[PDB]
Each structure stands twice: as C-alpha cells, then as structure tokens.
Design a protein around this nucleic acid. Structure first.
Ligand SMILES: Nc1ccc(CCNc2ncnc3c2ncn3[C@@H]2O[C@H](CO)[C@@H](O)[C@H]2O)cc1
Ligand SMILES: [K+]
Ligand SMILES: [K+]
Length: 544
DNA sequence: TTCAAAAAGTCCCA
DNA sequence: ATGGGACTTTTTGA
C-alpha cells in the first residue's frame, strides 16, 4: 500500500519548489503533501526549511519580533505553521509524527490529518505542494468510490481514467496564487485518451514549468510503472514556456550522479522547450527536428487510416482457458470443425505476414442448445463453468454461461485484413490471409470498398512498416514500459497516409518482400535491402 | 446491444 | 535474492 520514492527524486522535487523562496518576505510558507505516507517528502522539507530559517535568523529577528525569531524557536515554528501532511494510513501518520517530533515542556501541534484527501474540506490554500499520489486504474478501484469520483471530479475523471487524475485536480485547486506544485506521477496521462480532460485542466489552470519524462526507465524498483515529474505554478507570467527533459537511454541507473540535476544536464537526457499556448488537446512534446518531421508528414498526407479503413478489437472470450485449445489437443476431436477458428497471439505477428497459428478457438456462440453438443460443454468448456458464470454478462443473463463474452462479428474476421499487436517495440503490420481470429492483444482493420482502387493491402503494409512511419508513429504514441508502445486504434487510426508517384514501386517492393517471406528457404537479407530501398522511396515522397 | 481502453502490468530466470 | 527480458487477460464505462 506504500511506495517509496528514491531519495534523489525527492530531493529534486523539494529543491524545485523551495530553492528560491524569499523567507524574509514570507516567513510563514505552507508546504503540503496530501499522500505523505511515512514522510519521505516532509522530512526533507523540514531539513530544507531548517537550513533556510537558520541562515536568516538574524535578519528575521531584526525585521520582525526579535523575541520570536531565535534558533531555539525554529523547530516549533516549522511544525506549527509550515508543514502539512495528509494520508489515509493511520500507522504512517503516527510514524511521521514521531519522526517530526524527534527532529529536535509544552507539546507542539503537528498539522497531520488522517483522512481521504479527496473528501477533506480544505480550509485554506497552500504556497507549496509536493508528493507522490496513489495510482489506481479502472479495474482496481472500488465501484462505490468510482461513483463518488464520477460525481465530484467529473472535470478530470471519466471512463477509464485514473485516481491520480483526481489528485492532480485537488492539488491545482488548493494551490495559492503564485504557489508552486511539483509531483511524480505515471507518465501515461501525457498521451492517453483518458487523460484528455486532465491535460485540458492542467493547461488551462496552471503554468507548467517543467516536465521530466523518464519514458520506460524503471524508477521504482520492482514496480511496473513509467514515471514523470511535473512542476507547475500559479504565477503571473506572460511567456508560458515549458522545459522538457526527455530521457535518451532507458537502461540508465538513476544513482550515477549525486543529484538529479547533474543527470538532467548530462548526455543521458535531451532538453527542449514547448510553448504552452500552442498545446492542442494532444501534447506533442518533441524537439524542433522531430516537430519539423511530424509537420511535414501531416501536411503532405491527405488521408488517414480512419478515413479509408474499418477498425476493430479482437475477440474477448472472458475466460481464455475455457475456449482456446492447442491445435494438437485430442479434445478437439469432440468439436465439429465448423466451430473451430484459427487463433493467434501478438507474438505471431511480424512485419508483413503472420506466423502459422498453433491455437484454435471454440466459437461457442454457434452452439444452439446444451443437449445437442453436451459432450463439448461437459468435457471442455464446463471445466471452467464457475469462472464463466462470474462474468458480468452472465450474472445479468445477457450471455449464456458457455458463450463468449464478446464474440464480435465472425464476418469481420473471415476476410483479408491487416493485423497488428496491441503493444510492441516497433511497427508490425501484417496481411492476414488465413482468416485468423485473435484476442484483444491483436487489432485488425480492413479497407473500405470505396478506397480499394486508391489503396491496396500490400502498399499499406509497405509504408506502415517503414522506418519513416515507425518514427512518425512513435512521435505521438503512448510509451508504456521499456521498449513498448501502445498500438491502439485511438492512435493507430490517426496515422495519415499519402498517395503519389512512388505508389507503384512501393507496392512492388512490398509484394517482393511478402513473396520472399512466404518461401521455404527465406533469404532475409534481400528483404532488408528491399526495405532500405522502400524507405528511400518514402523519404523522397514525403520531402524529408 | 456491444464497442474499445486500461500497465503502482505479470511471470520467469540467471 | 534482484534486475532484466519476453510477452500480454478480461474487467469495465460508455
Ligand atoms: N479503493 C480506494 C478507496 C479509497 C481511497 C482513498 C483515496 N484517498 C487518499 N487520500 C489520501 N492518501 C491516500 C489516499 N489513497 C491512498 N493514499 C496514500 O497515498 C500513498 C500512496 O503512495 C499511501 O501512503 C496511501 O495511504 C483510495 C482507493
Ligand atoms: K525587530
Ligand atoms: K518501467
């Protein structure tokens, strides 16, 4: 339930919010952590504040009450007026209170609240806010609390949104005018469709000073999440430019230097600036060379995949072990071949073509009644009946216990089409010739009838598999973990395509590559040469 | 009725 | 034991 932020990052965030504070002008700053936990951030804040007060004690004594401002009174003052924490875990709050007391008679009152930060009536705003909020996705969040969030945090929380969206909104709302906030959250809201409303909220309510994007680097040990650090303020500024620090090597160990600033200035990161006013609903955080590249491609292409194609997600059985069998399984002798479909996984998809399938799907929707094919139900599917009965559509009666949860439309699959994995390190679009079915880890599309004369499957896999389109898609794609991007229709269908004088030769090269890849003695080397030639053709076409 | 999004991923090994 | 690499289910809101 508790996650420890590495000390280097905590130090960076506290220094980011407090390094230029004018303690003489305002000796009563309110610093808040609304998910403080054991006190990772607040103890460092206490250290920084103590040094800040102690270095200016005599100036404070001369400008204000000379009896109040003594070194012996610093500790008490810090706990009374400066440090605020909130967390829902009682034990963490008790431990933090003990630590803050032990940093150094009457008892000082420590501003630590044990509550739900999203429900607390906050009585005042704050000068500085730091911390690491909790991340809960749509599956792991309780439905009652989700009803609450959808009612009260609708500006950022809808559909498949995350709890830390609400923490972002809460932080922004309780930040004093001129205040500074700095947090570490998952990076996914920067590009995801669920994060659109949250991105709009941030852009329209704060000045984003700085974004540190670690991409697929493993910041939290033994945790599968990809992180970023956001720093924003509510200052009166007429410029609103963002400093973006994007990591270049995801294999880096984070403790190579003493400070995170040394790492950011180093050759391990790239830095660039983004105009906050030029942000659309999407945040395209790239350097000027990449921006030029992306804009050239966008302007030159007249069509998008959405215009010319029909997209769809694969089968969602709701229990794969009940419906998927190895093609050499003896139990398939009980199933009529009219009920069997070819089944592939994301790993069976290469550039341009699909591996031969090793699995079969029982399309159980076509089973009329339980008495005609009783053997299939009793001996194959029924072995998981309990689990099958706990699916949502079974509990509500919309679906029989032996039916596929989301069987889609068969006719969408039993046709020539293009398939691609839902998560990959590179563009892998293939032409499926074999009426392959797949789960939701594989997405498919086919070309609309009215665009068949303008675009062929061979040409499309030719350009989509090129290095140009690999880089082009990765510009705006959703970076998930190390060497993994989401390849989902909400972005894949936005890919723009072109049609010009190089169409015929690109198509010929694609057909040659496909012909070689379907041979017995594959000579992959000539495939690589042909791909290089096609990439040259594409770069000529797009004017890069 | 029925779409598609969602990594505090998941699991294994050296 | 940890860190790194291969690979990806079904719950869920709309
Ligand atoms: N199902 C569900 C039901 C209710 C909630 C309440 C959300 N409200 C919260 N308010 C304040 N602190 C919170 C918190 N949730 C977690 N935290 C702390 O955050 C830190 C993580 O690093 C931990 O120290 C954790 O305790 C969440 C999920
Ligand atoms: K004085
Ligand atoms: K990671």
């Amino acid at each position: 339930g508790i996650y420890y932020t590495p000390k280097i990052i905590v130090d960076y965030i506290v220094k980011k919010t407090l390094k230029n504070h004018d303690i003489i002008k305002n000796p009563y700053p309110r610093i808040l952590d609304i998910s403080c936990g054991c006190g990772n951030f607040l103890l460092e804040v206490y250290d920084i504040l103590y040094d800040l007060f102690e270095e200016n004690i005599y100036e404070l004594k001369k400008k204000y009450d000379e009896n109040y401002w003594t070194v012996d009174n610093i500790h008490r003052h810090i706990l009374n007026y400066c440090i605020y924490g909130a967390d829902i875990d009682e034990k963490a709050i008790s431990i933090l209170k003990d630590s803050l007391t032990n940093k150094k008679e009457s008892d000082i009152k420590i501003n630590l609240f044990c509550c739900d930060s999203l429900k607390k009536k906050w009585r005042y705003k704050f000068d500085y806010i730091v911390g690491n909020p909790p991340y809960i996705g749509h599956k792991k969040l309780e439905k009652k609390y989700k009803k609450f969030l959808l009612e009260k945090y609708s500006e950022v929380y809808k559909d498949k949104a995350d709890l830390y969206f609400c923490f972002y909104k809460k932080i922004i709302d309780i930040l004093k005018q001129g205040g500074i906030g700095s947090v570490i959250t998952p990076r996914y809201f920067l590009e995801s469709l669920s994060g659109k409303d949250l991105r709009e909220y941030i852009k329209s309510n704060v000045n984003v000073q700085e974004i540190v994007d670690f991409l697929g680097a493993n910041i939290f040990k033994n945790i599968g999440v990809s992180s970023c650090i956001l720093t924003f303020d509510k200052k009166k500024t007429k410029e609103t430019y963002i400093d973006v620090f994007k990591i270049k090597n995801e294999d880096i160990c984070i403790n190579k230097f003493e400070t995170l600033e040394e790492l950011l200035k180093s050759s391990k990161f790239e830095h660039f600036n983004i105009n906050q006013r030029l942000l659309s609903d999407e945040w395209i955080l790239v350097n000027k060379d990449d921006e030029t590249f992306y804009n050239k491609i966008q302007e030159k292409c007249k069509y998008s995949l959405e215009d010319i194609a029909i997209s769809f997600q694969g089968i969602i059985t709701g229990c794969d072990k009940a419906f998927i069998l190895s093609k050499d399984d003896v139990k398939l002798n009980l199933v009529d071949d009219k009920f069997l479909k070819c089944w592939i996984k994301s790993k069976n998809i290469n550039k341009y073509i699909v591996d031969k399938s090793e699995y079969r799907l029982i399309y159980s929707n076509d089973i009329d009644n339980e008495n005609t094919n009783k053997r299939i139900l009793d001996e194959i599917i029924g072995l998981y009946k309990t689990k099958l009965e706990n699916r949502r559509e079974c509990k509500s009666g919309i679906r029989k216990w032996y039916e596929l949860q989301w069987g889609r439309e068969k006719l969408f699959f039993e046709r020539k089409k293009i398939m691609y994995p839902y998560k990959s390190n590179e563009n892998r679009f293939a032409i499926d010739y074999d009426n392959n079915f797949s789960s939701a880890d594989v997405y498919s599309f086919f070309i609309k009838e009215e665009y068949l004369d303008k675009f062929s499957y061979e040409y499309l896999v030719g350009i989509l598999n090129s290095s140009v389109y690999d880089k082009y898609f990765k510009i705006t794609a959703k970076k998930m973990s190390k060497n993994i991007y989401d390849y989902y229709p909400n972005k894949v269908m936005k890919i723009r395509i072109f049609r010009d004088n190089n169409y015929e030769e690109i198509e010929n090269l694609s057909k040659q590559i496909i012909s070689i890849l379907l041979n017995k003695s594959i000579d992959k080397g000539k495939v690589e040469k042909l791909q290089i030639k096609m990439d040259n053709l594409i770069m000529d076409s797009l004017g890069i």
